[PDB]
């Protein structure tokens, strides 16, 4: 997998375990969380390369994602390719950009502006981009290039990437997950 980056934003909200050279991690939050964590494994510098994963993901009662997750340095952007999720669809509140088809499913696409919020530069203003899979799954290949090229039509810089990971995120409710990245 060539993992060279560990994502750990508030992993101590639950039980985050990882092994970089295996490309495995797990995150248990079965007692619930009241604030956001984002944990996972991947690459110091993102690219349009496809990502292949497999997971156990049990988040039905949780505001949670199983997602490709990363940033663009500038113009600053936080992005998600949500493969499965719990009780919160980001495209319910956010601005719809339509849909894109990739790897066997429609994805709902949306965007939001975050003003003076936590970022990879302290607190800042950035744009969020989300692809949310209509047919949810816990294993497969994400053709990242199809999401990047679609988002790029709506302002996504599609260059000058920061880190890029397969992640589990949750900020409300309880759940558990165990993930393997192969590529």
CA distances in angstroms from 160 to 61, 82, 157, listed in the order given: 36, 22, 8
Residue 173 is part of which domain span? Answer: 1-183
Name residue 17's beta-bridge partners: 26
Name residue 41's beta-bridge partners: 6, 166
User: Which candidate in 20, 56, 78, 83 is catalytic?
Assistant: 78
Q: Two tokens at 169? A: 């995120």
Q: Two tokens at 179? A: 């993930």
The CATH number of the domain holding residue 94 is: 2.60.120.180
Known catalytic membership, residue 78: yes
Known catalytic membership, residue 169: yes
Q: Are residues 169 and 69 in contact, defined by beta-carbon separation less than 8 angstroms?
A: yes
Query: Strand 77-85 and strand 122-133: pairing?
Result: parallel
Q: How many domains does the chain have?
A: 1
145 sits in which H/E element: helix 144-152
Beta strand spans in 44-138 (E): 51-58, 63-72, 77-85, 95-102, 105-119, 122-133
């Amino acid at each position: 997998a060539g993992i060279n980056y560990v994502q750990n934003y508030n992993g101590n909200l639950g039980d985050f375990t990882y092994d970089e050279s295996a490309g495995t991690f797990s995150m248990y939050w079965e007692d619930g969380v009241s604030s956001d964590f984002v944990v996972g494994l991947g690459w110091t510098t993102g690219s349009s390369n496809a990502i292949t994963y497999s997971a156990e993901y049990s988040a039905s009662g949780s505001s949670s994602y199983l997602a490709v997750y990363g940033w663009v340095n500038y113009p600053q952007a936080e992005y998600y390719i949500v493969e499965d999720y719990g009780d919160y669809n980001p495209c319910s509140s956010a601005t719809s950009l339509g849909t894109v088809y990739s790897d066997g499913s429609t994805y709902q696409v949306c965007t939001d502006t975050r003003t003076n919020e936590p970022s990879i530069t302290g607190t800042s203003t950035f744009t969020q981009y989300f692809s949310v899979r209509e047919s949810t799954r816990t294993s497969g290949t994400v053709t990242v290039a199809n999401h990047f090229n679609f988002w790029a039509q709506h302002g996504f810089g599609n260059s000058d990437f920061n880190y890029q990971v397969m992640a589990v995120e949750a900020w409300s409710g309880a759940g558990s997950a165990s993930v393997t990245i192969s590529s």
